[PDB]
Every structure is written in structure tokens, then in C-alpha cells.
Design a binder for this molecule. Sequence first.
Ligand code: C5P
Ligand code: C5P
Ligand code: PC
Ligand code: PC
Lengths: 469, 469
Amino acid sequence: PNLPGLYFLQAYPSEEIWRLFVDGRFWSKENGWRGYESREPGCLNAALESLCSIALQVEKSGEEFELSVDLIKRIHKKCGPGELRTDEPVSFGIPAGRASIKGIEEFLSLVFLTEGGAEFGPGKAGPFGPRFDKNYFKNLNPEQIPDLAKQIYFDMCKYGHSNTNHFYLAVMKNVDVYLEKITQSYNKEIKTAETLDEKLKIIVKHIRMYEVLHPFRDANGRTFVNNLLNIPLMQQGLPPATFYEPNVFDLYSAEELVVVVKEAIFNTVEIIEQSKRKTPITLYGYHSSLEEQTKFRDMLDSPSYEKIKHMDFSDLNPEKLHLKTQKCLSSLNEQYPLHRGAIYLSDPGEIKLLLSNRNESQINQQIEQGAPPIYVGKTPAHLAVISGNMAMLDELIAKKADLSLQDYDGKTALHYAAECGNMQIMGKILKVVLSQEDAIKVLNIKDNHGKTAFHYAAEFGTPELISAL
Amino acid sequence: PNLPGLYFLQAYPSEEIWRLFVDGRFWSKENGWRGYESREPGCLNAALESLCSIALQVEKSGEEFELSVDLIKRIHKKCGPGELRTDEPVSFGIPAGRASIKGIEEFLSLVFLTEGGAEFGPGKAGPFGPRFDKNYFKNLNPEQIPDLAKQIYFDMCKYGHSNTNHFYLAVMKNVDVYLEKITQSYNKEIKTAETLDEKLKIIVKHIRMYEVLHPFRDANGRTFVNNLLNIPLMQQGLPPATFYEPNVFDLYSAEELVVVVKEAIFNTVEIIEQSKRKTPITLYGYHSSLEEQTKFRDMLDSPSYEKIKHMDFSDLNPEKLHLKTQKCLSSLNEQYPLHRGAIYLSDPGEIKLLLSNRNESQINQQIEQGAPPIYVGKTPAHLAVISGNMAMLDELIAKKADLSLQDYDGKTALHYAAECGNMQIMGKILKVVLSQEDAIKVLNIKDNHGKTAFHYAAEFGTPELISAL
Ligand SMILES: Nc1ccn([C@@H]2O[C@H](COP(=O)(O)O)[C@@H](O)[C@H]2O)c(=O)n1
Ligand SMILES: Nc1ccn([C@@H]2O[C@H](COP(=O)(O)O)[C@@H](O)[C@H]2O)c(=O)n1
Ligand SMILES: C[N+](C)(C)CCOP(=O)(O)O
Ligand SMILES: C[N+](C)(C)CCOP(=O)(O)O
């Protein structure tokens, strides 16, 4: 098999297939996939048809898989206008939450960004694109890049974790040349890499450079991360990626992106395992209603996906394929164990064992920049609340965790409980909060938007439409 | 047609048919019907098969409908053991919430309760039945009944609205005789009654006496109120009854029971109208999930119900049938308008018109004993919260309603928001509560169980099973 990982695409539950396109950050607030589909009707099926039809295209070819700009252009056309930008300006903002100091350093060092005329710096959105107060690619002394990357990062934080102050204007000179150059470097380097980790590092390093060069007018994310990225992953015999936040392939470093991709691959493994074990899938605090599933099942239309669901992987060992991805993802195990536990662990006994002998600093630990986005500035408590992890929240409350701690968005465990509409988790926190003398001060905590937990609670489930009801 | 009201049984939406058996008080907390079915598996279908098979039995008979003890016994057998109690003791407790001063007066005046040896009074549950501190049927001076009925009622309140202090031990002498006597009185009196209101008064008066004489060892409620009661209602060309609390046919008066039955008939009219208008049915704060409906549709098994759904009422005018029930229920219109509005009204404009020119005493009005059970001791605010009436709660908040007022169970609008798990209504109340100086005092309000709103919120959706999860 040219793409042995296609086995995991087949194992992926049909009724949850949208999860490899819809960012996990949206699930709880937008009825899983519904909000993503309403923004661009037809976009889920087109993205699924694009992935499956091109993966089937590579598999049905004797020759060994080689990345090409024709491959990329076909992927863009399918996600839809098939052609590259020439002179067209493309820009976007980047919040602190989608950045890292090591990531900023690397981005400033991309020679094609300096020669291509790309711009990056602090500023404001203007009538025809960003109005830069500064552009870091103007007179950039390469010696100053480590110190400037620290400054840019602290400046992005000053504005707010989820707020956009920094803008990026892509390259407008020789996009076709850079596209071909990135492709050549990939094909040369991938052949060099011997281990799976080396391969992953090469893949993420190239996907990042493809994203940063924003070659298309639209759909760069879906093209490169939700499609392209999954092909070399499957080539390696790995599952495709289910992301919480895929929009990190600009200001994150290649090293930190390996971790981001591994966590995304782990999500797919949890999705498959839960479905196989007849367990109700609960990842990122989202429980799909039967109405949501039936609406998706009736909406689903992808012939190339149907061919993969009935594909013959009899001449392939699923056990060796399973043991290989388990070994590859084992690097995830000893990093922010309380945080990962609050996301993945549901067994009361495993949770109790994990929280044993842990101190006040470990239970209240807020992860710093560089970790995959969901962790940054968050306590295990914030993470239990967003994941619906009642067993973890109970253990944390028993461990005397501080529930008034605000994350980098100014949000407490109470703001997320209100935002997710969880009455039970909200009740547990409020029972705790009111048993302490500063109860009223804690309830009145305003986040970065000057909003209280009860302001969000008051807006929970409020229609997105102009309706009297 | 012998039972023209059968037309309304046909109009009743199949997927909501359980609503004429499951008390509206359970809906929000027990996933509509699920909790009722789990207490006695098979009990919903048996009750539906009993109603439809006997109604079909009366319709398929030339002779005019006459109540008989054979009819009653057949109904009991079908709800299941078909036979009457002889010597067997049957007892139950009655809380203040299921009583009225006028109702207590009438009950003490039932001559068959004195001669039959029934007991009623304050007390405690004992190993073999109640342990009476007093029995009002011992040396009852009929002159003292109005003053004693007031005392009994105030004593039942002292214990708590939803708490049981008063016990009733049914008749153990000549049940067969009283059953026949109640039946004869009914058949004689119904022929006397000329108007629909007179007929209703006779029906409720007799159903009450049948309930109070508890002739069966089990299922007296279902037999007499969910089955028997619906036959003369349909005979009159009226819809069957959908109740919030049917367990009022012991200590409520015949006059107050006409109102209880009219409100129950109005519920059926709202159910039918909402289904006909493709409106999602929301009565008593319960919105059925598609899983709940499909589980009920697959569980539903009643051949006699199937015959009624395809029955031919072509030789009957549905318009005259509709205009007659509208006239009959119009008595409901000018009683506790803010309360009924909080239950039934969803249109922002109608609600705003209704709350115009209303004072502080009208907006904060708590209904007294005698009204149908859902109203007693409740403000329009408590009622909006239990009904999910967001448009009414907004109007009430704008009208400066007091949200800290506790009902006869010691519960505030906040306790019901927590109990119903409504994040949005909870948020609205908390935004209000925190903007006032005594915020903390309001949140810490304990009901009759010494429980806070957040104690209930912490227990919302907690499993009823021994499960680790
Ligand atoms: N319908 C869509 C399409 C894209 N997106 C957002 O855009 C990201 C990918 O960017 P592209 O538009 O470049 O494909 C997604 O991860 C998601 O955050 C969305 O939110 N709804
Ligand atoms: N399965 C059942 C059957 C009856 N009930 C309760 O009993 C009442 C009727 O009493 P019976 O058992 O006499 O029929 C119902 O209105 C309801 O409150 C219940 O809660 N669950
Ligand atoms: C959000 N993003 C910066 C990762 C991709 C946006 O791509 P595009 O839609 O501008 O082409
Ligand atoms: C609850 N109730 C008093 C109206 C009826 C109980 O009847 P039963 O179940 O004791 O026969």
C-alpha cells in the first residue's frame, strides 16, 4: 500500500468524519459541525471529497508518492479557484494564542519572506488591508531576531491572548517559484529522514512554509493542513489529524508543530477507539445529539469516501500499524500530565492515582507558550471544564485547586462553564466559590472582553439569527 | 358518534400520546416519559390500550353510554388485579399542595367515609401503615367541619407544601356497595345536568368520590382519572385531559376540580394546535429530543390506539366540535392572567401588552389554595422559569419583578432554574441578583430541604443509577 494510513481513514466513524475538518475549538459552541457548514455551505463534503479522491489517486499509481505543485493545485480546485495568486494581496491577523517565541524567530528567518516582500508587524486593519505601525522585514538584522521574537511575543500578549494586534501581508513576488522550491526541498529532505520523528519534522516544516507562503487567494488552511498534511501522514502508516486549533502553521516552530500534529493524530486514535468500544464520543466537551448525527448522515455526499470505507486492506497488518502509531505518540505521555488528563481521562481511579502526591503548584499549573494551543495559560481546571471532565473537576476540587485563576483570555473555570452551558460543572464551582469569603469578588471577575461568567450564561444558546421566536 | 371527543384523541400527536398518562410535573426532570416507564415497565402501553379499547367498546354499541362497575373492573384489569379490595387496607399521605380548605370540608362531609371506617389525620408512616396522632372521622361534629378544614389546611402548610404529614386510610367495609352507589348516583345525576359545566361538575364530583373510595389495591389514579374521566369528557365532545398534577382528586373540591380538568383539557388543545402548526411542543419547560421520540415510537404498542388514529369521523363537524371546546374553556381566560401567561404565552408582543399597566403587587402575586396545583404559592416568575418562558422572564425582569421571592416549597426562581438546568434563564437571574447589594444572601437561600439553588445545580443530570461512569 502506497498510503497504509488509509486503513485509519476507513476505521474513522462515518458519522464523525467532519471532525477532521471542523476545529475542535468550535464543537461545544457550534453543535459540532453545523456552524462550520453554515459559514460556507458545501465546504465539508468538498473537503472530504478532495482528501479521499486525491488519496485514491496516489494509491492507484504504481510510482512512489512525490509531492508536486499540480497535486496542490488539484487539492485547491477540489476544496472549492484552482490557480495561484500572482499580484493579489492576501493578509490576516495572528493572535498571541497562535504564536510562540521559537515560532516567531523561525518566521523572521524565512529568507523568501524578506526577498518576496512580505510584511509583518503591529498595526490595525485598514480599508484595503492592514495599516502597519512597523514591518519587521524592513531592515531586519538577522542577529537581533532572537531578542525581537521575544519582544513581538510579549507585545502580542499585551494586546490579549485571543486578540489580533499583529498582521501579516503575504508575498506578492514569485509565488509560483517559491511553491516549486518548497515542493523540491520537501521531496529531497523526506528521502534523507530515516526515523518517523525525522519524517514528521520534515512534513511539518514544509507544510508550515507552504501555509506562510499563502499561494492561494482562499482556502490555504484546508489545502495544506486538512488535506496535503494527511497524505504524508498516511504514507508513513499514521492516522489523519483531528485538530482543536489547526491555525498554528504560521507563528509556531517546526518542533512545536510535531507536537501539535501528534496531539491531532492522538485525537483520531481516541475517536476510533471510542467508536470501536461502543463508548459515546465526548472529546472537547462535545456530545453529538442524534439529530445532529442524522442531519450529517443525510448531508454526507462523497463517492471517494465511500470507496475507502469498503477498501480492501487484507494484505496489511492492522496490529503492526496500531503498535507503530502507539510508539510514535508515546512522546505525548510525560508532558503536562494533569492537563492531558483533564482532556482525555474519564476513569475515576486513574484520575485519583494521577492527582496523588501532586502539590499546589502542579494542580494550579498554567502552561506557557510553545505547547499546543489548547494548553497555553490554562490550568487543569480550565481544561476539565471545557472537556466536560466531571471526574477530573471533582478530584481537582478535592485537591483544593484554585477555581478563581484566570487564563490568558481573563477567563476563569466559571466563564467556560457558562460558555459551555454545563449546569452540573457550574453548580460544583459555585458551591465551592460561595463557601469562601471573597465569593462576590470571584463571580464579578471580568475577562478580556469585560464580560462576567454570568454575562456568558445569559447569552448561552441565544440565536445567531434575527428572530423574535 | 357515542364519544365525539374521540376526534381529539385521533388529532393527538402519536409521538406525544404518553402526555395523557405522564404527569406534567415529571417532564422536565425525567426526560418526559422515561422515568414514568422505568418505575413500572409496560405501564404506558397498558394505560393507552385500556383507554382506547374501552372507548372503542362504548362507541361499538348501539345503546347509550352508561357507567357500570363492570366497566371500572375491565379498566383496572387492562391497566395491569381486576378485582376489588374487600378487607385489604390501602393508605397514602397527602401534602398541603394537593389540598384545599373547600376540598377538606367536602372530604370530611362524605358520609361513606364515616360509616365505612376510613381514617384521616396528622401522623407518621408506621411499619404496617400510618400511625395517626388524630383521626378526624372519630366523633366528627358536622357543625365543626368548616373551622376544622381551615385548621387541617394550616397544619398541612406548617409541615411544608410538598411534605407529607397527613395520612388517609381508606374504607375497609362494603367497598362493592359504595362502588355501585357512586355509579348509580353518577348515572342518575348526569341525566339531570343540562349545560356542559353542570355535566363537568357531576363528572368531577363522581370521579372524586371513586378516587377517595380507593376500591382497588393499586392503580386507582390511572383507572379513574387517566381512563374513566376521559370517557364522559369525550361523550360531551371534549378532548381528553393532559395533567400537570392529577393527584388532586382526594382533598380538592368538585368546583376546583372542574378548573383542574379544564386546564388539563386546555393542555391537550395546546398540544394538538402546536403539532398541527408544526410548532415545537414546549409545555411545562420540556422539549423532547429526537432520541426520546424515536425510543417512544419504537416502544409504542397499542392496537386499539391504531384503530382510533385511522377512525372515520367524516359524519362529524370538527369546527362545531372546536368552537364548543373553545367556549367551554373560555372560563380559564380571566384568572391569574400573569401566571397562565407565564405558562402558555411565547409571543413577545402579547406578553408586553399583558404586563402593561400592572403594579408591583400583581407582578409579585402568589396564588392561594384552591387554584389548580401548579399555581399555589407561585409568582409569574417561578412559572416562567419552570415553563422555559424566556420572553416572559425578560418582560418580568424589565417590570422589576422580585426574583428572591420563595414559593410554598421555599424555592426561588433560581432553585427552579438550577433544577431545570436552564443556563440562559439562570444567567439572566444571576445578572439581576448580583447587581443588587444583598446578592450573597439571595444565592444562599435554602428551600424547605435546606438546599440552595447551587446544591440543585450541582445535582443536575446526576445519574439515578449506581455507576462510576
Ligand atoms: N467554513 C469554514 C471554513 C474555514 N473555517 C476556518 O478556517 C480555517 C482554515 O482556513 P482556510 O479558509 O484557509 O481553509 C479552519 O481551521 C477554520 O478555523 C471556518 O471556520 N469555517
Ligand atoms: N409508573 C408510574 C405509575 C404511576 N405514577 C404516579 O401515580 C399516579 C397515579 O396513581 P396510580 O398508581 O393509582 O395509577 C400518577 O399520576 C403518577 O404520579 C408514577 O409516577 N409512575
Ligand atoms: C487562518 N489561516 C491563516 C491559517 C489561513 C487563512 O487562509 P486564507 O483563507 O486567507 O487563504
Ligand atoms: C396518588 N393517589 C392517591 C392519587 C392514588 C394512589 O392510588 P393507589 O396506587 O394507592 O391505588
